[PDB]
């Protein structure tokens, strides 16, 4: 309702809608793919639910339109869930998935006009060694 | 029945045909300008009736003149101004203004339909 008069808004809720999109036709995107938290990458429904990399790509494909540039926040937020649960193989697979998504962001933009920054809010008491 | 061009703060052309005294074109229904010198209404040719603070004569004396129950005009220019039309209730006005600015409850102007 709060979108300007002659603009295209969608709301999508599954993975098929996400890749059907024409990023030359969607000014506002809203995509809510799970009732709550999204599925761990190692548990994800290949069919109903997109990976983090998939969402980053069409997110950048939309936001590349604006000639002034864009700001994008990407949160690989399920690593925290993985460590919090003690399940290192999920937490480490979530981190690799966000890495894939960081690789995609590098080919869709150029480092000449795009500053990208990778960090974390905090750490966990996760160690490794013997 | 004043002559064309008569100053808005002036007198009417010929005198009263009842008490042979002049009167101003402007007159109030009530208010403080009701002035009666004795049992007669005030000969206005004496006093400065185009003065800033001159109080025109009224029918009924009151501390303060009152409002009026008649209707009032609405002048409208710009987007959707023609929605402001005819005789309507006063509360209609902000509903137009909101509708046209795409604010308030009805955001219909900013719908994807045409
Ligand atoms: C993904 O979402 C789309 C649209 O939300 C689904 O398409 C619907 O398909 C049914 C038939 O199965 C139609 O009756 C509906 O009208 C369609 N929805 C809309 C909004 O047009 C699609 O089935 C979903 N796919 C998956 C795998 O969940
Ligand atoms: C209202 O007052 C005016 C002015 O005081 C009166 O007009 C004058 O009347 C006298 C005699 O009636 C004349 O001699 C004057 O020449 C008039 N003009 C002026 C400028 O003084 C008028 O008659 C009064 N009306 C009433 C009903 O009392
Ligand atoms: C996802 O797709 C691959 C196809 O190569 C399949 O092996 C895998 O088991 C599928 N898993 C889920 C959870 O859909
Ligand atoms: Ca889903
Ligand atoms: Zn946490």
PDB file of C-alpha atoms and ligand atoms in Angstrom:
ATOM      1  CA  UNK A   1       0.000   0.000   0.000  1.00  0.00           C
ATOM      2  CA  UNK A   2       2.758   2.482   0.726  1.00  0.00           C
ATOM      3  CA  UNK A   3       4.464   2.000  -2.678  1.00  0.00           C
ATOM      4  CA  UNK A   4       4.460   4.800  -5.289  1.00  0.00           C
ATOM      5  CA  UNK A   5       1.657   4.969  -7.799  1.00  0.00           C
ATOM      6  CA  UNK A   6       3.099   3.272 -10.865  1.00  0.00           C
ATOM      7  CA  UNK A   7       5.453   0.672  -9.324  1.00  0.00           C
ATOM      8  CA  UNK A   8       5.511  -3.146  -9.358  1.00  0.00           C
ATOM      9  CA  UNK A   9       5.355  -4.954  -5.990  1.00  0.00           C
ATOM     10  CA  UNK A  10       5.324  -8.756  -5.682  1.00  0.00           C
ATOM     11  CA  UNK A  11       5.477 -10.675  -2.395  1.00  0.00           C
ATOM     12  CA  UNK A  12       6.765 -14.158  -3.175  1.00  0.00           C
ATOM     13  CA  UNK A  13       6.803 -17.099  -0.784  1.00  0.00           C
ATOM     14  CA  UNK A  14       8.567 -20.017  -2.537  1.00  0.00           C
ATOM     15  CA  UNK A  15      11.695 -20.746  -4.561  1.00  0.00           C
ATOM     16  CA  UNK A  16       9.861 -21.053  -7.905  1.00  0.00           C
ATOM     17  CA  UNK A  17       8.573 -17.481  -7.674  1.00  0.00           C
ATOM     18  CA  UNK A  18      12.093 -16.208  -6.858  1.00  0.00           C
ATOM     19  CA  UNK A  19      13.593 -17.407 -10.186  1.00  0.00           C
ATOM     20  CA  UNK A  20      10.468 -16.716 -12.236  1.00  0.00           C
ATOM     21  CA  UNK A  21      10.984 -13.000 -11.400  1.00  0.00           C
ATOM     22  CA  UNK A  22      12.075 -10.585 -14.095  1.00  0.00           C
ATOM     23  CA  UNK A  23      14.383  -8.155 -12.310  1.00  0.00           C
ATOM     24  CA  UNK A  24      13.574  -5.521 -15.013  1.00  0.00           C
ATOM     25  CA  UNK A  25       9.965  -5.492 -13.802  1.00  0.00           C
ATOM     26  CA  UNK A  26      10.085  -5.636  -9.979  1.00  0.00           C
ATOM     27  CA  UNK A  27      10.611  -2.323  -8.167  1.00  0.00           C
ATOM     28  CA  UNK A  28       9.688  -3.629  -4.715  1.00  0.00           C
ATOM     29  CA  UNK A  29      10.302  -7.238  -3.683  1.00  0.00           C
ATOM     30  CA  UNK A  30       9.091  -8.947  -0.494  1.00  0.00           C
ATOM     31  CA  UNK A  31       9.880 -12.619  -0.033  1.00  0.00           C
ATOM     32  CA  UNK A  32       8.974 -14.560   3.124  1.00  0.00           C
ATOM     33  CA  UNK A  33       9.883 -18.212   2.548  1.00  0.00           C
ATOM     34  CA  UNK A  34       9.208 -19.877   5.934  1.00  0.00           C
ATOM     35  CA  UNK A  35       6.787 -19.146   8.787  1.00  0.00           C
ATOM     36  CA  UNK A  36       9.736 -18.644  11.092  1.00  0.00           C
ATOM     37  CA  UNK A  37      13.451 -19.085  10.669  1.00  0.00           C
ATOM     38  CA  UNK A  38      14.470 -20.515   7.340  1.00  0.00           C
ATOM     39  CA  UNK A  39      15.708 -24.035   6.980  1.00  0.00           C
ATOM     40  CA  UNK A  40      19.439 -24.784   7.597  1.00  0.00           C
ATOM     41  CA  UNK A  41      21.224 -25.063   4.244  1.00  0.00           C
ATOM     42  CA  UNK A  42      21.830 -28.790   4.879  1.00  0.00           C
ATOM     43  CA  UNK A  43      18.071 -29.347   5.496  1.00  0.00           C
ATOM     44  CA  UNK A  44      16.623 -27.093   2.824  1.00  0.00           C
ATOM     45  CA  UNK A  45      13.835 -28.071   0.454  1.00  0.00           C
ATOM     46  CA  UNK A  46      15.597 -27.823  -2.965  1.00  0.00           C
ATOM     47  CA  UNK A  47      12.141 -27.066  -4.416  1.00  0.00           C
ATOM     48  CA  UNK A  48      10.131 -24.789  -2.093  1.00  0.00           C
ATOM     49  CA  UNK A  49      12.987 -22.791  -0.578  1.00  0.00           C
ATOM     50  CA  UNK A  50      15.952 -20.792  -1.944  1.00  0.00           C
ATOM     51  CA  UNK A  51      19.541 -20.895  -0.861  1.00  0.00           C
ATOM     52  CA  UNK A  52      21.203 -17.765   0.464  1.00  0.00           C
ATOM     53  CA  UNK A  53      23.128 -17.414  -2.809  1.00  0.00           C
ATOM     54  CA  UNK A  54      19.911 -17.546  -4.861  1.00  0.00           C
ATOM     55  CA  UNK A  55      18.358 -14.748  -2.793  1.00  0.00           C
ATOM     56  CA  UNK A  56      21.493 -12.572  -2.979  1.00  0.00           C
ATOM     57  CA  UNK A  57      21.612 -12.808  -6.768  1.00  0.00           C
ATOM     58  CA  UNK A  58      18.086 -11.674  -7.603  1.00  0.00           C
ATOM     59  CA  UNK A  59      18.344  -9.174  -4.735  1.00  0.00           C
ATOM     60  CA  UNK A  60      21.317  -7.558  -6.498  1.00  0.00           C
ATOM     61  CA  UNK A  61      19.639  -7.949  -9.869  1.00  0.00           C
ATOM     62  CA  UNK A  62      16.747  -5.805  -8.597  1.00  0.00           C
ATOM     63  CA  UNK A  63      18.876  -3.266  -6.738  1.00  0.00           C
ATOM     64  CA  UNK A  64      21.310  -2.729  -9.633  1.00  0.00           C
ATOM     65  CA  UNK A  65      18.553  -0.664 -11.362  1.00  0.00           C
ATOM     66  CA  UNK A  66      18.797   2.494  -9.190  1.00  0.00           C
ATOM     67  CA  UNK A  67      21.431   4.733 -10.854  1.00  0.00           C
ATOM     68  CA  UNK A  68      22.449   6.303  -7.522  1.00  0.00           C
ATOM     69  CA  UNK A  69      23.569   2.855  -6.225  1.00  0.00           C
ATOM     70  CA  UNK A  70      22.352   0.569  -3.500  1.00  0.00           C
ATOM     71  CA  UNK A  71      23.024  -0.657  -0.032  1.00  0.00           C
ATOM     72  CA  UNK A  72      22.458  -4.339   0.728  1.00  0.00           C
ATOM     73  CA  UNK A  73      22.584  -6.148   4.066  1.00  0.00           C
ATOM     74  CA  UNK A  74      23.137  -9.914   3.899  1.00  0.00           C
ATOM     75  CA  UNK A  75      22.971 -11.965   7.086  1.00  0.00           C
ATOM     76  CA  UNK A  76      24.108 -15.574   7.208  1.00  0.00           C
ATOM     77  CA  UNK A  77      22.179 -15.730  10.443  1.00  0.00           C
ATOM     78  CA  UNK A  78      21.884 -19.473  10.954  1.00  0.00           C
ATOM     79  CA  UNK A  79      25.530 -20.019  11.858  1.00  0.00           C
ATOM     80  CA  UNK A  80      24.611 -18.590  15.278  1.00  0.00           C
ATOM     81  CA  UNK A  81      21.754 -21.080  15.477  1.00  0.00           C
ATOM     82  CA  UNK A  82      24.148 -23.887  14.533  1.00  0.00           C
ATOM     83  CA  UNK A  83      26.695 -23.083  17.199  1.00  0.00           C
ATOM     84  CA  UNK A  84      23.976 -22.333  19.789  1.00  0.00           C
ATOM     85  CA  UNK A  85      22.718 -25.875  19.234  1.00  0.00           C
ATOM     86  CA  UNK A  86      26.242 -27.394  19.450  1.00  0.00           C
ATOM     87  CA  UNK A  87      25.943 -28.833  15.927  1.00  0.00           C
ATOM     88  CA  UNK A  88      29.213 -27.786  14.295  1.00  0.00           C
ATOM     89  CA  UNK A  89      28.429 -29.388  10.933  1.00  0.00           C
ATOM     90  CA  UNK A  90      25.405 -27.170  10.470  1.00  0.00           C
ATOM     91  CA  UNK A  91      27.167 -24.040  11.686  1.00  0.00           C
ATOM     92  CA  UNK A  92      30.135 -24.683   9.399  1.00  0.00           C
ATOM     93  CA  UNK A  93      27.889 -25.446   6.396  1.00  0.00           C
ATOM     94  CA  UNK A  94      25.973 -22.228   6.955  1.00  0.00           C
ATOM     95  CA  UNK A  95      29.282 -20.336   6.879  1.00  0.00           C
ATOM     96  CA  UNK A  96      30.318 -22.017   3.628  1.00  0.00           C
ATOM     97  CA  UNK A  97      26.968 -21.127   2.107  1.00  0.00           C
ATOM     98  CA  UNK A  98      27.367 -17.480   2.942  1.00  0.00           C
ATOM     99  CA  UNK A  99      30.788 -17.683   1.368  1.00  0.00           C
ATOM    100  CA  UNK A 100      29.226 -18.918  -1.897  1.00  0.00           C
ATOM    101  CA  UNK A 101      26.898 -15.921  -1.678  1.00  0.00           C
ATOM    102  CA  UNK A 102      29.938 -13.621  -1.180  1.00  0.00           C
ATOM    103  CA  UNK A 103      31.441 -15.072  -4.351  1.00  0.00           C
ATOM    104  CA  UNK A 104      28.254 -14.311  -6.302  1.00  0.00           C
ATOM    105  CA  UNK A 105      28.237 -10.715  -5.062  1.00  0.00           C
ATOM    106  CA  UNK A 106      31.710 -10.349  -6.574  1.00  0.00           C
ATOM    107  CA  UNK A 107      30.727 -11.225 -10.106  1.00  0.00           C
ATOM    108  CA  UNK A 108      27.529  -9.145 -10.219  1.00  0.00           C
ATOM    109  CA  UNK A 109      29.343  -5.971  -9.044  1.00  0.00           C
ATOM    110  CA  UNK A 110      32.711  -4.329  -9.544  1.00  0.00           C
ATOM    111  CA  UNK A 111      35.167  -3.348  -6.782  1.00  0.00           C
ATOM    112  CA  UNK A 112      35.683  -0.011  -8.507  1.00  0.00           C
ATOM    113  CA  UNK A 113      32.341   1.394  -7.342  1.00  0.00           C
ATOM    114  CA  UNK A 114      31.232  -1.220  -4.766  1.00  0.00           C
ATOM    115  CA  UNK A 115      32.569  -1.392  -1.268  1.00  0.00           C
ATOM    116  CA  UNK A 116      31.589  -4.768   0.238  1.00  0.00           C
ATOM    117  CA  UNK A 117      32.367  -5.659   3.859  1.00  0.00           C
ATOM    118  CA  UNK A 118      32.265  -9.121   5.479  1.00  0.00           C
ATOM    119  CA  UNK A 119      32.175  -9.453   9.247  1.00  0.00           C
ATOM    120  CA  UNK A 120      30.399 -11.082  12.219  1.00  0.00           C
ATOM    121  CA  UNK A 121      28.514  -9.604  15.181  1.00  0.00           C
ATOM    122  CA  UNK A 122      30.388 -11.754  17.729  1.00  0.00           C
ATOM    123  CA  UNK A 123      31.902 -15.247  18.087  1.00  0.00           C
ATOM    124  CA  UNK A 124      31.072 -18.520  19.886  1.00  0.00           C
ATOM    125  CA  UNK A 125      33.063 -20.735  22.289  1.00  0.00           C
ATOM    126  CA  UNK A 126      33.827 -22.988  19.298  1.00  0.00           C
ATOM    127  CA  UNK A 127      37.403 -24.305  19.193  1.00  0.00           C
ATOM    128  CA  UNK A 128      39.135 -26.900  17.122  1.00  0.00           C
ATOM    129  CA  UNK A 129      42.332 -28.797  17.595  1.00  0.00           C
ATOM    130  CA  UNK A 130      44.096 -31.821  18.814  1.00  0.00           C
TER     131      UNK A 130
ATOM    132  CA  UNK B   1     -28.267  49.674  -3.444  1.00  0.00           C
ATOM    133  CA  UNK B   2     -24.931  51.417  -3.504  1.00  0.00           C
ATOM    134  CA  UNK B   3     -23.468  52.919  -6.694  1.00  0.00           C
ATOM    135  CA  UNK B   4     -20.781  51.005  -8.528  1.00  0.00           C
ATOM    136  CA  UNK B   5     -17.418  51.641  -6.978  1.00  0.00           C
ATOM    137  CA  UNK B   6     -18.793  52.904  -3.661  1.00  0.00           C
ATOM    138  CA  UNK B   7     -16.180  52.319  -0.980  1.00  0.00           C
ATOM    139  CA  UNK B   8     -16.938  49.174   0.970  1.00  0.00           C
ATOM    140  CA  UNK B   9     -16.712  51.243   4.170  1.00  0.00           C
ATOM    141  CA  UNK B  10     -19.036  53.991   2.872  1.00  0.00           C
ATOM    142  CA  UNK B  11     -22.687  55.041   3.206  1.00  0.00           C
ATOM    143  CA  UNK B  12     -25.652  53.948   1.160  1.00  0.00           C
ATOM    144  CA  UNK B  13     -26.875  56.497  -1.440  1.00  0.00           C
ATOM    145  CA  UNK B  14     -30.102  57.944  -0.075  1.00  0.00           C
ATOM    146  CA  UNK B  15     -31.108  58.258   3.546  1.00  0.00           C
ATOM    147  CA  UNK B  16     -33.383  55.990   5.497  1.00  0.00           C
ATOM    148  CA  UNK B  17     -36.944  56.554   4.460  1.00  0.00           C
ATOM    149  CA  UNK B  18     -37.975  55.874   8.100  1.00  0.00           C
ATOM    150  CA  UNK B  19     -35.801  58.142  10.255  1.00  0.00           C
ATOM    151  CA  UNK B  20     -34.237  60.298   7.509  1.00  0.00           C
ATOM    152  CA  UNK B  21     -30.671  59.346   8.908  1.00  0.00           C
ATOM    153  CA  UNK B  22     -28.033  57.738   6.668  1.00  0.00           C
ATOM    154  CA  UNK B  23     -26.698  54.204   7.065  1.00  0.00           C
ATOM    155  CA  UNK B  24     -23.566  52.283   6.104  1.00  0.00           C
ATOM    156  CA  UNK B  25     -23.648  49.624   3.419  1.00  0.00           C
ATOM    157  CA  UNK B  26     -21.978  47.252   5.877  1.00  0.00           C
ATOM    158  CA  UNK B  27     -24.306  46.146   8.696  1.00  0.00           C
ATOM    159  CA  UNK B  28     -24.082  43.412  11.331  1.00  0.00           C
ATOM    160  CA  UNK B  29     -26.856  41.162  12.555  1.00  0.00           C
ATOM    161  CA  UNK B  30     -25.762  41.615  16.190  1.00  0.00           C
ATOM    162  CA  UNK B  31     -22.657  42.679  18.054  1.00  0.00           C
ATOM    163  CA  UNK B  32     -21.474  45.886  19.702  1.00  0.00           C
ATOM    164  CA  UNK B  33     -22.115  48.271  16.789  1.00  0.00           C
ATOM    165  CA  UNK B  34     -25.750  48.539  17.905  1.00  0.00           C
ATOM    166  CA  UNK B  35     -25.650  52.095  19.138  1.00  0.00           C
ATOM    167  CA  UNK B  36     -28.740  54.074  20.215  1.00  0.00           C
ATOM    168  CA  UNK B  37     -28.225  57.715  21.330  1.00  0.00           C
ATOM    169  CA  UNK B  38     -31.387  58.128  23.437  1.00  0.00           C
ATOM    170  CA  UNK B  39     -34.289  56.339  21.764  1.00  0.00           C
ATOM    171  CA  UNK B  40     -32.902  57.125  18.317  1.00  0.00           C
ATOM    172  CA  UNK B  41     -30.301  55.272  16.335  1.00  0.00           C
ATOM    173  CA  UNK B  42     -27.058  57.192  15.851  1.00  0.00           C
ATOM    174  CA  UNK B  43     -26.745  59.765  13.067  1.00  0.00           C
ATOM    175  CA  UNK B  44     -23.636  58.296  11.430  1.00  0.00           C
ATOM    176  CA  UNK B  45     -22.701  61.411   9.392  1.00  0.00           C
ATOM    177  CA  UNK B  46     -21.219  62.821  12.601  1.00  0.00           C
ATOM    178  CA  UNK B  47     -18.704  60.034  13.314  1.00  0.00           C
ATOM    179  CA  UNK B  48     -15.741  58.690  11.287  1.00  0.00           C
ATOM    180  CA  UNK B  49     -17.280  55.604   9.698  1.00  0.00           C
ATOM    181  CA  UNK B  50     -14.328  54.707   7.497  1.00  0.00           C
ATOM    182  CA  UNK B  51     -12.088  54.572  10.564  1.00  0.00           C
ATOM    183  CA  UNK B  52     -10.195  51.329  11.210  1.00  0.00           C
ATOM    184  CA  UNK B  53     -12.052  50.560  14.425  1.00  0.00           C
ATOM    185  CA  UNK B  54     -15.532  51.873  13.490  1.00  0.00           C
ATOM    186  CA  UNK B  55     -18.224  49.413  14.526  1.00  0.00           C
ATOM    187  CA  UNK B  56     -21.054  49.141  11.985  1.00  0.00           C
ATOM    188  CA  UNK B  57     -24.585  49.187  13.368  1.00  0.00           C
ATOM    189  CA  UNK B  58     -26.295  45.967  14.276  1.00  0.00           C
ATOM    190  CA  UNK B  59     -29.783  44.841  15.206  1.00  0.00           C
ATOM    191  CA  UNK B  60     -29.016  43.428  18.664  1.00  0.00           C
ATOM    192  CA  UNK B  61     -26.368  44.583  21.202  1.00  0.00           C
ATOM    193  CA  UNK B  62     -23.782  42.040  22.366  1.00  0.00           C
ATOM    194  CA  UNK B  63     -20.282  42.080  23.919  1.00  0.00           C
ATOM    195  CA  UNK B  64     -19.218  40.303  20.705  1.00  0.00           C
ATOM    196  CA  UNK B  65     -20.818  39.706  17.304  1.00  0.00           C
ATOM    197  CA  UNK B  66     -21.777  36.080  16.639  1.00  0.00           C
ATOM    198  CA  UNK B  67     -21.025  33.493  14.016  1.00  0.00           C
ATOM    199  CA  UNK B  68     -23.479  32.624  11.286  1.00  0.00           C
ATOM    200  CA  UNK B  69     -25.072  29.384  10.423  1.00  0.00           C
ATOM    201  CA  UNK B  70     -24.994  29.817   6.603  1.00  0.00           C
ATOM    202  CA  UNK B  71     -22.638  27.739   4.493  1.00  0.00           C
ATOM    203  CA  UNK B  72     -19.171  28.686   3.336  1.00  0.00           C
ATOM    204  CA  UNK B  73     -17.151  28.316   0.172  1.00  0.00           C
ATOM    205  CA  UNK B  74     -14.412  25.854  -0.681  1.00  0.00           C
ATOM    206  CA  UNK B  75     -11.806  26.966  -3.237  1.00  0.00           C
ATOM    207  CA  UNK B  76      -9.743  24.157  -4.679  1.00  0.00           C
ATOM    208  CA  UNK B  77      -6.911  23.969  -7.175  1.00  0.00           C
ATOM    209  CA  UNK B  78      -4.443  21.205  -7.901  1.00  0.00           C
ATOM    210  CA  UNK B  79      -4.584  17.415  -8.051  1.00  0.00           C
ATOM    211  CA  UNK B  80      -8.082  15.987  -7.506  1.00  0.00           C
ATOM    212  CA  UNK B  81      -9.487  19.412  -6.557  1.00  0.00           C
ATOM    213  CA  UNK B  82     -12.643  18.641  -8.552  1.00  0.00           C
ATOM    214  CA  UNK B  83     -13.531  15.976  -6.015  1.00  0.00           C
ATOM    215  CA  UNK B  84     -14.394  19.023  -3.912  1.00  0.00           C
ATOM    216  CA  UNK B  85     -17.768  19.788  -5.489  1.00  0.00           C
ATOM    217  CA  UNK B  86     -21.359  20.692  -4.727  1.00  0.00           C
ATOM    218  CA  UNK B  87     -22.922  21.070  -1.295  1.00  0.00           C
ATOM    219  CA  UNK B  88     -21.273  18.675   1.117  1.00  0.00           C
ATOM    220  CA  UNK B  89     -20.736  18.280   4.851  1.00  0.00           C
ATOM    221  CA  UNK B  90     -17.706  20.028   6.324  1.00  0.00           C
ATOM    222  CA  UNK B  91     -15.970  16.864   7.428  1.00  0.00           C
ATOM    223  CA  UNK B  92     -15.730  15.810   3.781  1.00  0.00           C
ATOM    224  CA  UNK B  93     -12.793  18.135   3.109  1.00  0.00           C
ATOM    225  CA  UNK B  94      -9.763  16.412   4.694  1.00  0.00           C
ATOM    226  CA  UNK B  95     -10.996  13.120   3.221  1.00  0.00           C
ATOM    227  CA  UNK B  96     -10.444  14.524  -0.245  1.00  0.00           C
ATOM    228  CA  UNK B  97      -7.132  16.029   0.794  1.00  0.00           C
ATOM    229  CA  UNK B  98      -5.958  12.771   2.324  1.00  0.00           C
ATOM    230  CA  UNK B  99      -7.256  10.667  -0.591  1.00  0.00           C
ATOM    231  CA  UNK B 100      -5.345  12.779  -3.127  1.00  0.00           C
ATOM    232  CA  UNK B 101      -2.062  12.854  -1.168  1.00  0.00           C
ATOM    233  CA  UNK B 102      -2.218   9.036  -0.664  1.00  0.00           C
ATOM    234  CA  UNK B 103      -2.309   9.364   3.139  1.00  0.00           C
ATOM    235  CA  UNK B 104      -4.867   8.564   5.860  1.00  0.00           C
ATOM    236  CA  UNK B 105      -7.072   5.462   5.700  1.00  0.00           C
ATOM    237  CA  UNK B 106      -7.935   5.329   1.970  1.00  0.00           C
ATOM    238  CA  UNK B 107      -4.796   4.879  -0.140  1.00  0.00           C
ATOM    239  CA  UNK B 108      -6.869   4.159  -3.229  1.00  0.00           C
ATOM    240  CA  UNK B 109      -5.336   6.897  -5.405  1.00  0.00           C
ATOM    241  CA  UNK B 110      -2.016   4.994  -5.217  1.00  0.00           C
ATOM    242  CA  UNK B 111      -3.374   1.592  -6.149  1.00  0.00           C
ATOM    243  CA  UNK B 112      -1.897  -0.349  -9.113  1.00  0.00           C
ATOM    244  CA  UNK B 113      -5.392  -0.265 -10.801  1.00  0.00           C
ATOM    245  CA  UNK B 114      -4.850   2.382 -13.585  1.00  0.00           C
TER     246      UNK B 114
HETATM  247  C1  LIG C   1       4.780 -21.328  -5.550  1.00  0.00           C
HETATM  248  O1  LIG C   1       3.870 -20.203  -5.472  1.00  0.00           O
HETATM  249  C2  LIG C   1       2.982 -20.094  -6.593  1.00  0.00           C
HETATM  250  C3  LIG C   1       2.224 -18.796  -6.424  1.00  0.00           C
HETATM  251  O2  LIG C   1       2.153 -18.386  -5.065  1.00  0.00           O
HETATM  252  C4  LIG C   1       2.076 -21.324  -6.662  1.00  0.00           C
HETATM  253  O3  LIG C   1       1.211 -21.202  -7.792  1.00  0.00           O
HETATM  254  C5  LIG C   1      -0.180 -21.485  -7.494  1.00  0.00           C
HETATM  255  O4  LIG C   1      -0.547 -22.689  -8.200  1.00  0.00           O
HETATM  256  C6  LIG C   1      -1.880 -23.142  -7.920  1.00  0.00           C
HETATM  257  C7  LIG C   1      -2.027 -24.501  -8.563  1.00  0.00           C
HETATM  258  O5  LIG C   1      -1.188 -25.456  -7.924  1.00  0.00           O
HETATM  259  C8  LIG C   1      -2.876 -22.106  -8.426  1.00  0.00           C
HETATM  260  O6  LIG C   1      -4.212 -22.537  -8.193  1.00  0.00           O
HETATM  261  C9  LIG C   1      -2.632 -20.787  -7.705  1.00  0.00           C
HETATM  262  O7  LIG C   1      -3.544 -19.814  -8.207  1.00  0.00           O
HETATM  263  C10 LIG C   1      -1.166 -20.327  -7.866  1.00  0.00           C
HETATM  264  N1  LIG C   1      -0.911 -19.139  -7.054  1.00  0.00           N
HETATM  265  C11 LIG C   1      -0.975 -17.873  -7.506  1.00  0.00           C
HETATM  266  C12 LIG C   1      -0.677 -16.795  -6.498  1.00  0.00           C
HETATM  267  O8  LIG C   1      -1.261 -17.608  -8.671  1.00  0.00           O
HETATM  268  C13 LIG C   1       2.925 -22.588  -6.765  1.00  0.00           C
HETATM  269  O9  LIG C   1       2.084 -23.738  -6.716  1.00  0.00           O
HETATM  270  C14 LIG C   1       3.975 -22.653  -5.641  1.00  0.00           C
HETATM  271  N2  LIG C   1       4.882 -23.775  -5.846  1.00  0.00           N
HETATM  272  C15 LIG C   1       5.427 -24.483  -4.848  1.00  0.00           C
HETATM  273  C16 LIG C   1       6.366 -25.574  -5.258  1.00  0.00           C
HETATM  274  O10 LIG C   1       5.162 -24.266  -3.668  1.00  0.00           O
HETATM  275  C1  LIG C   2     -27.251  64.279  10.793  1.00  0.00           C
HETATM  276  O1  LIG C   2     -26.096  65.132  10.974  1.00  0.00           O
HETATM  277  C2  LIG C   2     -25.802  65.968   9.841  1.00  0.00           C
HETATM  278  C3  LIG C   2     -24.533  66.744  10.161  1.00  0.00           C
HETATM  279  O2  LIG C   2     -24.447  67.216  11.501  1.00  0.00           O
HETATM  280  C4  LIG C   2     -27.000  66.856   9.476  1.00  0.00           C
HETATM  281  O3  LIG C   2     -26.706  67.555   8.265  1.00  0.00           O
HETATM  282  C5  LIG C   2     -26.665  68.993   8.499  1.00  0.00           C
HETATM  283  O4  LIG C   2     -27.979  69.456   8.888  1.00  0.00           O
HETATM  284  C6  LIG C   2     -28.023  70.845   9.246  1.00  0.00           C
HETATM  285  C7  LIG C   2     -29.428  71.106   9.737  1.00  0.00           C
HETATM  286  O5  LIG C   2     -30.218  69.923   9.714  1.00  0.00           O
HETATM  287  C8  LIG C   2     -27.623  71.702   8.042  1.00  0.00           C
HETATM  288  O6  LIG C   2     -27.686  73.083   8.386  1.00  0.00           O
HETATM  289  C9  LIG C   2     -26.233  71.305   7.546  1.00  0.00           C
HETATM  290  O7  LIG C   2     -25.873  72.066   6.393  1.00  0.00           O
HETATM  291  C10 LIG C   2     -26.181  69.788   7.265  1.00  0.00           C
HETATM  292  N1  LIG C   2     -24.856  69.365   6.817  1.00  0.00           N
HETATM  293  C11 LIG C   2     -23.733  69.405   7.553  1.00  0.00           C
HETATM  294  C12 LIG C   2     -22.489  68.905   6.875  1.00  0.00           C
HETATM  295  O8  LIG C   2     -23.714  69.827   8.711  1.00  0.00           O
HETATM  296  C13 LIG C   2     -28.279  66.027   9.336  1.00  0.00           C
HETATM  297  O9  LIG C   2     -29.417  66.867   9.150  1.00  0.00           O
HETATM  298  C14 LIG C   2     -28.483  65.140  10.568  1.00  0.00           C
HETATM  299  N2  LIG C   2     -29.682  64.326  10.433  1.00  0.00           N
HETATM  300  C15 LIG C   2     -30.562  64.153  11.429  1.00  0.00           C
HETATM  301  C16 LIG C   2     -31.746  63.279  11.123  1.00  0.00           C
HETATM  302  O10 LIG C   2     -30.410  64.681  12.526  1.00  0.00           O
HETATM  303  C1  LIG C   3      18.396 -32.039  -3.424  1.00  0.00           C
HETATM  304  O1  LIG C   3      18.770 -32.416  -4.797  1.00  0.00           O
HETATM  305  C2  LIG C   3      19.806 -33.400  -4.964  1.00  0.00           C
HETATM  306  C3  LIG C   3      19.912 -33.647  -6.459  1.00  0.00           C
HETATM  307  O2  LIG C   3      21.258 -33.731  -6.911  1.00  0.00           O
HETATM  308  C4  LIG C   3      19.480 -34.670  -4.160  1.00  0.00           C
HETATM  309  O3  LIG C   3      20.555 -35.606  -4.199  1.00  0.00           O
HETATM  310  C5  LIG C   3      19.201 -34.317  -2.705  1.00  0.00           C
HETATM  311  O4  LIG C   3      18.957 -35.489  -1.926  1.00  0.00           O
HETATM  312  C6  LIG C   3      18.052 -33.312  -2.609  1.00  0.00           C
HETATM  313  N1  LIG C   3      17.765 -33.026  -1.208  1.00  0.00           N
HETATM  314  C7  LIG C   3      16.666 -32.404  -0.758  1.00  0.00           C
HETATM  315  C8  LIG C   3      16.563 -32.255   0.742  1.00  0.00           C
HETATM  316  O5  LIG C   3      15.801 -31.971  -1.521  1.00  0.00           O
HETATM  317 CA1  LIG C   4       9.387 -22.353   2.085  1.00  0.00          CA
HETATM  318 ZN1  LIG C   5      23.075 -15.859  19.158  1.00  0.00          ZN
END
